[PDB]
RNA sequence: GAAAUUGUUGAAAGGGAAGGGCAUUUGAUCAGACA
RNA sequence: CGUGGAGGUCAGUGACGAAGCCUAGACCGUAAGGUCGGGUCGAACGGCCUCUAGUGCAGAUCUUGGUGGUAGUAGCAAAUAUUCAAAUGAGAACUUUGAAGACUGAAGUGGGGAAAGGUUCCACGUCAACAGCAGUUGGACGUGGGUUAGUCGAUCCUAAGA
């Protein structure tokens, strides 16, 4: 149940037509709804090093594709609704276009 | 040594009603004065041809 | 505007506190209290201001000396040691 | 305390009450009317679904110019809403009445909410300020809520 | 907690402005007892409160 | 009292407004200001034909 | 102002010391019909015109 | 602890108002029993 | 016919319940109205013969107070902009810290002052009301602390003037 794998999210087709003051605040919610259906639990936490990689070039100027690694961890607290939670952190790669989704080996 | 709870059981029961008494007198002062609050002598209207 | 823009310049007083009556009625440029001319020897009181004489008449204050004169008259302005 | 017109017996019932609560009377009346007569567990699942934004509360009397929705179709109405403050204040009294019934010893499997009413409370004045320098009123409509859950007989 | 007065006292102690004061996020439970300015100086020398560096305005293109 | 009902300094607002033409207590900042005075149908006014 | 007079400071001192709630043991007296300090004043609502 | 105004329960009615007058059916309620 | 008081009388009614109030319950009168039953309630009140008047309301853009429909409606749209994690907490779009992104751009959204304000300054505790959403926050609420001069001003001088 505790799985972790990497995805490429095409944010260009999510932030199309969105207002310029809301591109990166929409991108946060689109990454949350991405990780709400891949490994489909609620309570998706992003990383601050993911937030500052969304927000690298302002409100407008989110990158076209991001490379994430979503980890469905098990909740350490009591958590009396949805006892699993995702955790989304970026993968530092150059030119994140051209990669499929792969399952990283648990260690 | 251990004694954990310490708060006042009469000084809050005597404040929860003097607060509502103060609030009730404030409300009955608002509503017994809010009839002629909008009485403006020498009010000219900015409407004409 | 003569209403809301011209109420912004209201920041210097024309009346201050009087010494004979303690209320903010002492004009500063002309130096006369408008509720009881302070410079004048007589307090202002007019017969058309019959309500305004009620707020300043005898009995509105402490009456430090005058509240004892009837008690002293009733005994007849007696002096000396009381009794055994 | 004296309650409303309750045609039940006191040996099988348990009541709860709240006065001067600052929920709106118009929304809290529809919240209190949507669960009138229901089972206790069915009402407690239903209000949690309302807060989870499925299965809206049908607005029936105080419903002028509110929006139409697709979740009114289970009640026949076309106008319905999801008042969160009203659902939370009703849910607290449902929990308190369930606790009073468990302290009296009634079995919680057959508790249904028989009598439930809201009344207006004294308003709470506060000013709004309008054009051309005139005050109006801008006040709240608090509500008393009272509730009785009783156990189902033959 | 509420370190809004500790950040003010640290700005006044270090002498740099409030936008250059760094309070340690893993040590708010220790920072919260620093009500004095002496305790703020103790935290400054202890390394819990650090002055941040001046943002660079370069004159190289000029 | 011969001064009962008439310890007010009130005068009517007249037409040009949408209130009745009874004498109204001028001023402001209290609940009394604006209220109808001096009448016999009023509250705080002298009676009709005060008893002598 | 910051450069005030003693006649103004002496009245501001009285207006400070008059700005307190009613003492709690006043309400325990026998024929006590004083329920709250009805001459309370703060700088937001009403100004003292001195 | 009245009325305006409101909630719940019960009864009844309801094709672009509602209310009222005369008459009777139907439902409720009351009456005296001529005891 | 009805109301508030007065002089007589019923050696009138009443804590075993006076007055009041509610009552698609009953009776009498053409009617004004009067009487009874039930519920509520808690200290005084009626019948008749007369006397007296501040004596009967549907209206006066009536006076004062209270409440509706509109209506959970109009709206809560100027000042470029917010996002993530953690802490606290019953509860976090709004508090605190860190990380980002931005803004005022030295005629500033900075640092002081004059009028004016009066304790708003600062700390601890608190969130019923106020902050036209919220609130664990606050110029709010409760309790306290705080303003140190031979040199800075007033004080002294005169101006237009009083
Ligand atoms: Zn004077």
Smallest Cα distance from F16 to chain B, Å: 10
Under 8 Å between Cβ of E48 and E23: yes
E58 lies in some domain: no
Estimate in Å the CA D144 to C1' I37 gap, whole number. Answer: 36
How far is it, in rounded angstroms, from Cα D152 to Cα C30? Answer: 88
CA–CA dist G20, A38 (Å, integer): 62
CA–CA dist E40, B7 (Å, integer): 33
Q: Strands, E, within D22-124: which ranges?
A: 57-58, 80-81, 111-120
Size of interface B-G (CB pairs under 8 A): 11
- Residue G39 Cα to ligand 1 midpoint, Å, equals 24
Residue A11: give the domain boundaries: 6-96
Cβ atoms of G26 and G34 closer than 8 Å: yes
Q: How far is it, in rounded angstroms, from Cα D58 to Cα D76?
A: 9
Question: Could you tell me the distance in Å between the CA of residue A84 and the C1' of nucleotide I123?
Answer: 44
- The whole domain housing D142 covers 9-154
Block residue for tokens 């390394």: E47
User: Residues in chain E, how many?
Assistant: 62
Does chain G touch chain B (at least 3 C-beta pairs within 8 Å)? yes
Nearest to A7 by CA among A33, A38, A37, A29: A38
With respect to residue E29, please indicate whether it lies within any of the assigned structural domains.
yes
Reported resolution, Å: 3.2
CATH number at residue E32: 1.10.1650.10
Overall number of domains in chain A: 1
Tokens 């026949």 belong to which residue? Answer: D76
Answer for the pair C20, C43: CB distance below 8 angstroms, yes or no.
Answer: yes
Q: How many other C-beta atoms are found inside a 10 Å radius of the C-beta of residue D117?
A: 17
Cα(D51)–Cα(D87) distance, integer angstroms: 7
Domain count along chain D: 1
Neighbour subunits, F (≥3 Cβ pairs < 8 A): B
Write down the experimental method used for this entry. Answer: cryo-EM
Q: How many domains does chain E have?
A: 1
End-to-end CA distance of chain E: 46
User: Which of A43, A31, A26, A23 is closest to A7 using CA atoms?
Assistant: A31
Tell me if E60 is assigned to some domain: no
Which nucleotide C1' is nearest D120 CA?
A: H6
Q: Is E9 domain-assigned? A: yes
- Six token digits for residue D90: 């009703």
In a domain, A55, yes or no: yes
Residue A1 lies in a domain: no
Q: Which of B21, B37, B39, B43 to mutate to test the interface with D (most CBs of D within 10 A)?
A: B37
Give me the domain span that covers residue E38. 3-51
Residue at minimum CA to C1' distance from nucleotide I162: C30
Which among D122, D124, D134 has the least Cβ separation from residue B38? D134
In a domain, D2, yes or no: no
């Amino acid at each position: 149940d505790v799985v972790t794998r990497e995805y490429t999210i095409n944010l260009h087709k999510r932030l199309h037509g969105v207002s310029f003051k809301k591109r990166a605040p929409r991108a946060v919610k689109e990454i949350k709804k991405f990780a709400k259906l891949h490994m489909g639990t609620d309570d998706v936490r992003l990383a601050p090093e993911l937030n500052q990689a969304i927000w690298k070039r302002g409100v407008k100027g989110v990158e076209y594709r991001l490379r994430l690694r979503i980890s469905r961890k098990r909740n350490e607290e009591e958590d009396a609704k949805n006892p699993l939670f995702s955790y989304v952190e970026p993968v530092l790669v150059a030119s994140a276009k051209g990669l499929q989704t792969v399952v990283v080996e648990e260690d | 040594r251990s004694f954990l709870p310490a708060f006042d059981k009469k000084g809050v029961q005597t404040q929860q009603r003097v607060w509502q008494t103060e609030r009730f007198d404030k409300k009955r002062l608002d509503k017994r004065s809010a009839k002629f609050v909008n009485n403006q002598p020498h009010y000219r209207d900015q409407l004409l041809q | 505007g003569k209403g809301t823009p011209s109420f912004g310049k209201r920041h210097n007083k024309s009346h201050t506190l009087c010494n004979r009556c303690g209320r903010r009625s002492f004009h500063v440029q002309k130096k006369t209290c408008s509720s009881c001319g302070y410079p004048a020897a007589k307090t202002r009181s007019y017969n058309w201001g019959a309500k305004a004489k009620r707020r300043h008449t005898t009995g509105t204050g402490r009456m430090r000396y005058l509240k004892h004169v009837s008690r002293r008259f009733k005994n007849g302005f007696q002096t000396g040691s009381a009794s055994k | 305390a004296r309650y409303g017109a309750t045609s039940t017996n006191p040996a099988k019932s348990a009541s709860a009450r709240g006065s001067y609560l600052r929920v709106s009377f118009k929304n809290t009346r529809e919240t209190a009317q949507a669960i009138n007569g229901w089972e206790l567990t069915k009402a407690q699942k239903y209000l949690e679904q309302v807060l989870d934004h499925q299965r809206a509360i049908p607005f029936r009397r105080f419903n002028s110019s509110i929006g139409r929705t697709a979740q009114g179709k289970e009640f026949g109405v076309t106008k319905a809403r999801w008042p969160a403050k009203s659902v939370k204040f009703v849910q607290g009294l449902l929990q308190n009445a369930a606790a009073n019934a468990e302290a009296k010893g009634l079995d919680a499997t057959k508790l249904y909410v028989s009598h439930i009413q809201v009344n207006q409370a004294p308003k709470q004045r506060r000013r709004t300020y309008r054009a051309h320098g005139r005050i109006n009123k801008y006040e709240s409509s608090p509500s008393h809520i009272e509730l009785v859950v009783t156990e189902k007989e033959e | 907690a509420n370190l809004r007065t500790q950040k003010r006292l640290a700005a006044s102690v270090v002498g740099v402005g409030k936008r250059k004061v760094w309070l340690d996020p893993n040590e708010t439970s220790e920072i919260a007892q620093a009500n004095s300015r002496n305790a703020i100086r103790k935290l400054v020398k202890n390394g819990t409160i650090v002055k941040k560096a001046v943002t660079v305005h370069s004159k190289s293109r000029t | 009292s011969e001064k009962a009902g008439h310890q007010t300094s009130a005068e009517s607002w007249g037409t040009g407004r949408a209130v009745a033409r009874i004498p109204r207590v001028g001023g402001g900042g209290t609940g009394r200001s604006g209220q109808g005075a001096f009448g016999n149908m009023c509250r705080g006014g002298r009676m009709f034909a005060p008893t002598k | 102002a910051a450069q005030k007079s003693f006649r103004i400071k002496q009245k501001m001192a009285k207006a400070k010391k008059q700005n307190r709630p009613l003492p709690q043991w006043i309400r325990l007296r026998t024929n006590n019909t004083i329920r709250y300090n009805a001459k309370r004043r703060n700088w937001r609502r009403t100004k003292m015109n001195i």
